[PDB]
């Protein structure tokens, strides 16, 4: 009865999937039928073998406490904590690999330093000397100091400069100032053990402390170091959606997250031997396509075409045109191994962090990265000989998209509206001014996943379209950004098409689209860098600005960690999918009310995007009045 | 027409008082839960993202076979198993992390001092720390820093104990499970269990084994060694156990939890003259300290403090109406205590910011002024004796004598009695190695683990231990299992004639030891590894070659899972008396109970009948003896 998507190409292939007789993520959601209301409310605990225990989400009725004595609030808050601990760890290991790659950069090696100016500037944040030193001794000293942020047991951690000092001392008084990344993950996992913490407030506060090691450390260093090694993103053109697949080219799709592999596949797709090889098997060339975050990472830096977002990964295989599906870690549906048994596609896993049964394991040798990517790519190009062009169905649907909007590039773009003799250059002042003046009502980040509980991409598009109509500039990352890209919002033409008067004027003056694709989900750290720069420039804290974050169709534990650190940093967050918290009323009051008194923001749970847009606008105008703007 | 709740007499008496007083127990809450969910009982339910919750069929080929993301039953089972190990590892991790921090803050005239210099000097040589002619506290700080790097170093290798055989290290390396930093492996396991990551049962379990190794050989190990350095290495010491140790006319302060620093500082505060006179002024005879669970073991091994009871007895202690102060830190403090303590004059005090409990009294243990903080907290217990009502008090006159303190150094010390002055070398484990190879001792078995309402409490412990020592298998015990043995009376030299077999009784008479050796808390299980490795190293073999076994007859916590996983990966067959949630994943069962043997030389055994378990252990040991030629 309900529509499965709002994207036509997504729907066309869904029909082919039914004809071919293959399962999709929608079909498995249906097979699940009415999902257990206990786990949907968070009032089930399995933290020890006395259980499984389930208490009633309706207070006063049914079973009240678990066998150990845990209340509903205790069970909910611990389950919520372990979600943050998981998402934190996901981004943690991500940035740890990126820092390790930076430690192994050499002058003549496969991994180099590409943005010397950024490294010199990042080195100043770690108190690493740069005057007259070799650029790789600097990079190694930066990597070492960044790695210390993951497991140091003595001393304090290094935090970015755009984090307002008001917020640091706020965290200190609240007792949520971050420690080492792995050290907090262990701390949350410790207190959630049976017979440890049994207080909702203290439990949530540990979760907020954990999430800070993600946004301002794990994800932040991951992004900063990814820019140093691969290049800081700048505005770039690309095409999005499943129509980027070419029938007469070798289609290699990069799925996953960790960017070192996809960065090396891009460089491997230009080796004359591998270029000549694709021609020898009968194709026109090598057509690199990205999906999800590793697709975002290479599109921001190299404009590689974005094949699609989370709930489309199954449908790319259904086209019958994917010769290689090269995946690393995070958000690779294990169903792909069974699905690709019905097609010539070679589904190749590469990271020992994410083995998948019945896939083809080709370990990405991080000690010979380029040679290793070539070996994996050659296997994909050879697989082109096994394509059956009669069963191929590539929908004729693709949209142009502009992305590459890093903080540096937004600042660079804003310099255009600065009078040579008046203001300062290379600052975020132009954006602060249009916010203070009121031409822009606010700025909203729209991030998040896809989720079968929501018509895929429908909540993203309605939220984004509604915010830009009310003169709220919108920045996007991850699968939401790729949902904007497919729809056609990442175009300068989208301003007069969909934006209100103020946003349309700023868009024309700055020469930008109304929706800024700021990269992958570790790249959300760019959003914090941006908002923090505006707060510092206006002498205020981040809870005082008219900013907001939205997760219209989230799913991953990464999103819970992301949403939790966005709030603790001081930014109101709207969720479009109810988290499993309804069972514990104290947990609800903490996340949706008391949070305000702690950090200056709170969570909002709204499944109607049009309602959420109202709330965001009203909350912004409320905060605007408090600030006098 | 129901099963008994316990085999302990004092436990049954107070349970009748709890019913009479109108309060609820952990047994009562178990009955309220009724039929627990078969899905979560089989481990075929996932909640690792909001696409779910999903539940797949535990019977393969029937029902819903895959979750929304495509995860099979084996994937879901294997990931849920991994997160148990990660949590159990994290608990012992932070336990030893905090202890190492105390070692870093030791000082000449401070509250925390170095007490076993000879242990500290020997540990420093294990961490490549110079000791010749250096101040003793410069050494302690260097050793602490080296131990803290084991938790979060990102480059280089980790420091491991010398009693770990190189054959086992080389085995782990080829298998791909050589441990990294403690907090790092915890994060790595949490990463791969995220949605859309690892989806292969073998790779997932192998990640669990690599993670658990950072507990037994690092987390728990460093915690135990550093606890001995600061508080003293345990030696043969007498004590009394069970709930009767409470004195009606004295101040009863009960220490519950795991972290030893608070319990240690309260012991030293219980001898402050100002507080003793206050105890007499409020109308009491003296300060009666009683411990529970690990923190009760930690102070009983070192100071002979009386042991109040094990895990499922903690509620019944408050039911006696004689607990004036209940001081708890972290790990295994049932949140029901906060509600139970409201029906009695007991003040339920939480002390650690790691484990706040609602509607309790929070007195944050100041580690910068430890003794003054312990003094301050103890005074609140003494003053609460004025609210005692002696008409309701019912302390069952039941308690048994017990011997403990059997650290590795003390066991080696006791083995010297049977060494000839001219023949063999002193201060080695050779006497224990010789009786095993000869066959006088058929094997060595470690009985550890929790309590669990699914088993008649302490019955699986006592039946397991009694059957083993009857079959000439010496039994070492830690944690609540040890306290089960202390309550029943197995921690006595008189227990040899009563229950031991011929060979074991002969070894007990010669060495002058009980047939059951209490080796401390559950981080003190590292002492058991340290012992077995010395025997493995002295016989030129690996640990999977020795006739050794581990048993957790009534386990419950995720700490036990991580414990049982590192015991197996170390090369010691482990029997489990409570079935873990793995029955829904047939590949996971094959990995844990068969394939594991071909990886690390040991495997899990799931058996709820302790008599059948003893049969399996004895037959298994004989196979490894015949394989080894002994
Ligand atoms: S922590 Fe408590 S409520 Fe949760 S499963 Fe364990 S015994 Fe039950
Ligand atoms: S969430 Fe709990 S009650 Fe629901 S199916 Fe899973 S184990 Fe059962
Ligand atoms: S990870 Fe898979 S099995 Fe688990 S809740 Fe998500 S879709 Fe379901
Ligand atoms: F095909
Ligand atoms: F790893
Ligand atoms: F159910
Ligand atoms: F493996
Ligand atoms: F009382
Ligand atoms: F000693
Ligand atoms: F074997
Ligand atoms: Na920066
Ligand atoms: Na195939
Ligand atoms: Na309020
Ligand atoms: Na030692
Ligand atoms: Na076999
Ligand atoms: Na059975």
Separation between Cα atoms, residue A516 and residue A525, nearest integer Å: 14
Question: How far, in Å, is the centroid of ligand 14 from the Cα of B122?
Answer: 7
- Beta bridge mates, A604: A574
Name the nearest CA neighbour of B189 among A464, A189, A510: A189
Cβ neighbours of B194 in A, within 8 Å:
86-87, 89-90, 330, 556-558
Contact B7, B459 (CB under 8 A): yes
Q: Would you say the CB of residue A425 lies under 6 angstroms from ligand 1?
A: no
Chain breaks in chain A (C to N over 2.5 A) after: none
Chain B: give the shortest CA distance to residue A351, in Å: 9
Q: Do B555 and A49 touch (CB under 8 A)?
A: yes
Orientation angle between helical segments B479-488 and B293-303, nearest 10 degrees: 70
Contact B28, B36 (CB under 8 A): no
Torsion of CA B356, B358, B363, B364, to 10 degrees: 20
Dig out the tokens for B51 from the structure.
């696409």
Burial of B595 (0-12, 13-18, 19+ CB in 10 A): middle
Separation between Cα atoms, residue A531 and residue A538, nearest integer Å: 11
Contact A604, A575 (CB under 8 A): yes
Separation between Cα atoms, residue A534 and residue B555, nearest integer Å: 54
Question: How far, in Å, is the centroid of ligand 13 from the Cα of A587?
Answer: 15
Separation between Cα atoms, residue A629 and residue B436, nearest integer Å: 83
Chain B: give the shortest CA distance to residue A56, in Å: 11
Q: Would you say the CB of residue A53 lies under 6 angstroms from ligand 1?
A: yes
Task: Tell me how far the alpha carbon of residue B614 is from its chain's centroid.
Answer: 21
- Beta bridge mates, B309: B292
Cβ neighbours of A152 in B, within 8 Å:
152
Measured from the alpha carbon of residue A334, the closest ligand is 3
Name the nearest CA neighbour of B482 among B469, B465, B494: B465
Instruction: Spell out the alpha helix ranges (H) of B421-501.
Output: 430-438, 459-470, 479-488, 495-499
Separation between Cα atoms, residue A310 and residue A292, nearest integer Å: 6
Report the Cα–Cα distance between both ends of chain A, in Å, rounded: 46
Report the Cα–Cα distance between both ends of chain B, in Å, rounded: 48
Question: Which atom of ligand 3 is nearest the CA belonging to B195?
Answer: 1
At a CB cut-off of 8 Å and minimum separation 6, what does B192 contact? A329, A353, A354, B79, B82, B198, B203, B204, B207
Name the nearest CA neighbour of A29 among A316, A309, A311: A311
Task: Tell me how far the alpha carbon of residue A70 is from its chain's centroid.
Answer: 34
Contact A469, A498 (CB under 8 A): yes
Mutate to test the interface with A, among B147, B152, B193 (most CBs of A within 10 A): B152
Chain B residue closest in CA terms to A358: B200
Torsion of CA A427, A429, A431, A433, to 10 degrees: -170
Q: Do B198 and A355 touch (CB under 8 A)?
A: yes
The label of the residue with tokens 């990079």 reads A139
Q: Is B163 helix (H, G, I), strand (E, B) or coil?
A: coil
B151: DSSP letter: H
Q: Do B581 and A46 touch (CB under 8 A)?
A: yes
HEC sequence for B346-402? CEEEECCCCCCECCCEECCCCCCCHHHHHHHHHHHHHHHHHHCCCCCCCCCCCCEEE
E-state strands within A62-168: none
Q: Do A180 and B152 touch (CB under 8 A)?
A: yes
- Beta bridge mates, B252: B288
Label the pairing between strands A346-349 and B287-292. unpaired
Name the nearest CA neighbour of B388 among B596, B521, B493, B247: B247
Name the nearest CA neighbour of A212 among A581, A530, A566: A566
The number of C-beta contacts closer than 8 angstroms across A and B is 319
At a CB cut-off of 8 Å and minimum separation 6, what does A418 contact? A424, A425, A429, A430
Separation between Cα atoms, residue B447 and residue B478, nearest integer Å: 7
Backbone angles phi, psi at A270, to 5 degrees: -120, 0
Chain A: give the shortest CA distance to residue B498, in Å: 34
Dig out the tokens for A238 from the structure.
């690309």
A157: DSSP letter: P
Separation between Cα atoms, residue B220 and residue A619, nearest integer Å: 50
Question: How far, in Å, is the centroid of ligand 12 from the Cα of A341?
Answer: 4
HEC sequence for A374-397? HHHHHHHHHHHHHCCHHHCCCCCC
Measured from the alpha carbon of residue B609, the closest ligand is 16
Q: Do B199 and A87 touch (CB under 8 A)?
A: no
A551: DSSP letter: E
Dig out the tokens for A231 from the structure.
């290049």
Label the pairing between strands B237-241 and B400-404. antiparallel
Label the pairing between strands B443-447 and B473-477. parallel
Burial of B10 (0-12, 13-18, 19+ CB in 10 A): buried
Task: Tell me how far the alpha carbon of residue A43 is from its chain's centroid.
Answer: 28
- Beta bridge mates, B576: B552, B606
Name the nearest CA neighbour of B317 among B299, B336, B331, B298: B336
Chain B: give the shortest CA distance to residue A182, in Å: 5
- Separation in Å, CA A309 to CA A254, A291, A304, B127: 12, 6, 14, 49
Q: For a pocket test of ligand 1, which of A68, A76, A195 has the largest count of ligand atoms closer than 8 A to its C-beta?
A: A68
Chain A residue closest in CA terms to B582: A49
Nearest to B48 among A50, A73, A557 (CB): A557
What element of type H or E holds B404?
strand B400-404
For ligand 3, atom 6, which residue shows the shortest CA distance?
A: B49
Contact A546, A435 (CB under 8 A): yes
Q: For a pocket test of ligand 2, which of A41, A49, A50, A54 has the largest count of ligand atoms closer than 8 A to its C-beta?
A: A54
Torsion of CA A178, A182, A187, A188, to 10 degrees: 90
Burial of A11 (0-12, 13-18, 19+ CB in 10 A): middle
Mind giving me the DSSP string for A437-494? HSSS-EEEEE-----TTS-BTHHHHHHHHHHHHTTEEEEE-HHHHHHHHHHT-SSTTH
Q: Would you say the CB of residue B76 lies under 6 angstroms from ligand 3?
A: yes
Label the pairing between strands A53-54 and A286-291. unpaired
Q: Would you say the CB of residue A67 lies under 6 angstroms from ligand 1?
A: yes
Q: For a pocket test of ligand 1, which of A38, A42, A51 has the largest count of ligand atoms closer than 8 A to its C-beta?
A: A51
Q: Do A186 and B188 touch (CB under 8 A)?
A: no
What element of type H or E holds B267?
helix B260-269
Contact B69, B47 (CB under 8 A): no
Separation between Cα atoms, residue B297 and residue B239, nearest integer Å: 11
Q: Is B119 helix (H, G, I), strand (E, B) or coil?
A: helix
Measured from the alpha carbon of residue B390, the closest ligand is 8
Preceding omega of B53 cis (within 30 degrees of 0):
yes
Question: How far, in Å, is the centroid of ligand 15 from the Cα of B172?
Answer: 19
Q: For a pocket test of ligand 2, which of A35, A36, A41 has the largest count of ligand atoms closer than 8 A to its C-beta?
A: A36
3-state helix, strand, coil split of chain B in percent (to 5) is 50, 10, 35
Separation between Cα atoms, residue A573 and residue A562, nearest integer Å: 10
A311: DSSP letter: G
Separation between Cα atoms, residue B177 and residue B217, nearest integer Å: 13
Question: How far, in Å, is the centroid of ligand 16 from the Cα of B608?
Answer: 6
Resolution value (Å, 1 decimal):
3.0
Dig out the tokens for A5 from the structure.
């998507």
Contact B338, B358 (CB under 8 A): yes
Separation between Cα atoms, residue B93 and residue B99, nearest integer Å: 10
Contact A350, A261 (CB under 8 A): yes
Using only C-alpha atoms, chain A has a radius of gyration, in whole angstroms, of 24
Count the Cβ atoms, other than its own, within 10 Å of residue B273: 7
Cβ neighbours of A103 in B, within 8 Å:
155
What element of type H or E holds A361?
strand A360-361
Q: How many residues does chain A have?
A: 629
For ligand 1, atom 6, which residue shows the shortest CA distance?
A: A48
Backbone angles phi, psi at B627, to 5 degrees: -65, -40
Nearest to B90 among A103, A189, A357 (CB): A189
Q: Do A183 and B88 touch (CB under 8 A)?
A: no
The label of the residue with tokens 């592999």 reads A261
Separation between Cα atoms, residue B336 and residue B340, nearest integer Å: 6
Separation between Cα atoms, residue A503 and residue A495, nearest integer Å: 7
The label of the residue with tokens 């900063």 reads A224
Name the nearest CA neighbour of B537 among B528, B525, B547, B546: B546
HEC sequence for A233-302? CCCEEEEECHHHCCCCCEEEEEECCCHHHHHHHHHHCCCHHHHHHHHHCCCCCEEEEEEHHHHHHHHHHH
The label of the residue with tokens 């839960």 reads B33
A330: left (phi over 0), alpha (psi -120 to 50) or beta: left
- Separation in Å, CA A266 to CA A108, A136, A462, B214: 18, 24, 34, 38
Name the nearest CA neighbour of A414 among A342, A536, A507: A507
Contact B213, B566 (CB under 8 A): yes
Torsion of CA B204, B208, B214, B217, to 10 degrees: -130
Q: Do B556 and A67 touch (CB under 8 A)?
A: no
Q: Do A35 and B29 touch (CB under 8 A)?
A: no
Separation between Cα atoms, residue A320 and residue B444, nearest integer Å: 60
Mind giving me the DSSP string for B32-86? HH-S--HHHHHT-EE-SSTT--EE--SSTTSS--B-TT--BHHHHHHHHHHHHHH
Q: Is A199 helix (H, G, I), strand (E, B) or coil?
A: coil
Backbone angles phi, psi at B272, to 5 degrees: -70, 125
Chain B residue closest in CA terms to A332: B196
Cβ neighbours of A354 in B, within 8 Å:
192, 196-199
Backbone angles phi, psi at B300, to 5 degrees: -80, -40
């Amino acid at each position: 009865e309900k529509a499965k998507s709002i994207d036509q190409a997504t729907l066309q292939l869904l029909d082919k999937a039914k004809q071919d007789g293959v399962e999709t993520v929608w079909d498995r959601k249906a097979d699940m039928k009415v999902q257990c209301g206990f786990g949907s409310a968070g009032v089930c605990c399995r933290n020890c073998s006395m259980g499984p225990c389930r208490v009633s989400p309706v207070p006063g009725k049914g079973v009240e406490r678990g066998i150990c004595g845990a209340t509903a609030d205790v069970i909910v808050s611990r389950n919520f904590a372990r979600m943050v601990a998981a998402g934190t760890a996901a981004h943690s290991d991500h940035g740890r690999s990126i820092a390790l790659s930076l430690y192994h950069t050499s002058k003549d090696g496969d991994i180099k330093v590409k943005d010397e100016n950024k490294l010199k500037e990042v080195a100043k944040s770690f108190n690493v000397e740069t005057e007259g030193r070799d650029i790789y001794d600097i990079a190694h000293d930066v990597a070492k100091e960044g790695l210390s942020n993951y497991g140091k047991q003595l001393g304090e951690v290094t935090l970015p400069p755009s984090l307002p000092e008001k917020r640091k001392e706020l965290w200190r008084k609240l007792g949520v100032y971050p420690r080492a990344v792995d050290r907090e993950i262990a701390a949350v996992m410790h207190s959630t053990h049976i017979g440890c913490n049994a207080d909702a407030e203290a439990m949530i506060k540990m979760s907020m402390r954990c999430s800070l090691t993600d946004g301002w450390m794990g994800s932040f260093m991951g992004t900063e170091f990814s820019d140093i090694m691969f290049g800081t993103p700048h505005s770039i053109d690309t095409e999005a959606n499943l129509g980027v697949l070419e029938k007469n080219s070798v289609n290699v799709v990069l799925h996953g997250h960790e960017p070192l592999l996809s960065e090396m596949v891009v460089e491997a797709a230009s080796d004359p031997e591998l270029v000549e090889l694709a021609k020898s098997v009968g194709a026109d060339g090598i057509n690199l396509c990205g999906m999800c975050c590793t697709g975002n990472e290479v599109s921001m830096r190299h404009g590689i075409k974005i094949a699609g977002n989370f709930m489309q990964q199954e449908l790319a295989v259904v086209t019958g045109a994917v010769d290689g599906l090269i995946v690393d870690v995070q958000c690779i549906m294990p169903a792909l191994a069974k699905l690709s048994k019905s097609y010539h596609t070679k589904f190749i896993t590469t990271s020992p962090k994410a083995h998948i049964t019945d896939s083809i394991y080709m370990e990405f040798d991080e000690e010979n990265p380029l040679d290793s990517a070539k070996k994996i790519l050659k296997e994909a190009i050879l697989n082109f000989k096994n394509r059956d062009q009669s069963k191929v169905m590539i929908p004729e649907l693709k949209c142009k998209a502009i992305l590459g909007y890093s903080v540096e590039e937004i600042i660079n773009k804003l310099d255009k509206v600065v009078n040579t003799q008046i203001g300062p250059m290379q600052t975020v002042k132009p954006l602060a001014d249009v916010l203070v003046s009121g031409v822009l009502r606010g700025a909203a980040a729209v991030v998040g996943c896809n989720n079968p509980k929501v018509v895929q991409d429908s909540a993203h598009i309605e939220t984004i379209k509604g915010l830009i109509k009310n003169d709220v500039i919108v920045v996007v990352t991850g699968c939401a950004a790729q949902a904007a890209a497919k729809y056609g919002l990442l175009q300068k033409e989208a301003a007069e098409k969909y934006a209100g008067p103020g946003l349309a004027t700023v868009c024309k003056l700055v020469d930008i689209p109304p929706v800024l694709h700021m990269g992958s989900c570790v790249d959300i750290s760019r959003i914090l860098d941006l908002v923090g720069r505006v707060a510092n420039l206006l002498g205020v804290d981040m809870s005082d600005l008219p900013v907001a974050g939205v997760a219209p169709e989230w799913m991953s534990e990464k999103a819970v960690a992301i949403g939790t650190y966005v709030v603790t940093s001081g930014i109101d967050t709207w969720l479009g999918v109810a988290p499993p918290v309804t069972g514990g009323p104290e947990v609800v009051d903490i996340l949706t009310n008391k949070m305000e008194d702690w950090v200056g923001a709170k969570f909002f749970i709204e499944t109607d995007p049009h309602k959420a847009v109202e709330q965001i606008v009203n909350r912004m105008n409320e905060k605007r009045k408090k600030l006098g703007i």
